[PDB]
Design a protein that fits this description.
Elements (H helix, E strand, L loop, with lengths): L4 E2 L5 H6 L4 E7 L4 H16 L5 E6 L6 H4 L7 E6 L2 E7 L4 H11 L2
Parallel strand pairs: 1-3, 2-3
Antiparallel strand pairs: 2-4, 4-5
PDB class: electron transport
Keywords: Alpha Beta, Electron transport
Assembly: monomeric
Length: 108
């Protein structure tokens, strides 16, 4: 919570679907080891990608509604949205190097 949008099921439309640009949503849970591995990396990305995209996190236990809409099974799942439409999907943990390459390739 500096640049990261802490999303809810009620805030999801406004925060993600109505945003004039790119949003990287992280579907995640507290018990999930790989999710917690990538949190510090998302902190990094949010800073590094100022003005290019916003990072948003949706905890799928506290907010149960949203994930079934996007077919999410494995977590973490990262969905790159561009103006409310999903452009790119990444399932499971990955490094900062790997995530940057994912974003750079798909933001274009």
């Amino acid at each position: 919570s500096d640049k990261i949008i802490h999303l809810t099921d009620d805030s999801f439309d406004t925060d993600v679907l109505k945003a004039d640009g790119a949003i990287l949503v992280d579907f995640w849970a507290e018990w999930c080891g790989p999710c917690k591995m990538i949190a510090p990396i998302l902190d990094d990305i949010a800073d590094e990608y100022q003005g290019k995209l916003t990072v948003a996190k949706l905890n799928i236990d506290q907010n149960p509604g949203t994930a079934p809409k996007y077919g999410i099974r494995g977590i973490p799942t990262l969905l790159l949205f561009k103006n409310g439409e999903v452009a790119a999907t990444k399932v499971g943990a990955l490094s900062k190097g790997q995530l940057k390459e994912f974003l750079d390739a798909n933001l274009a």
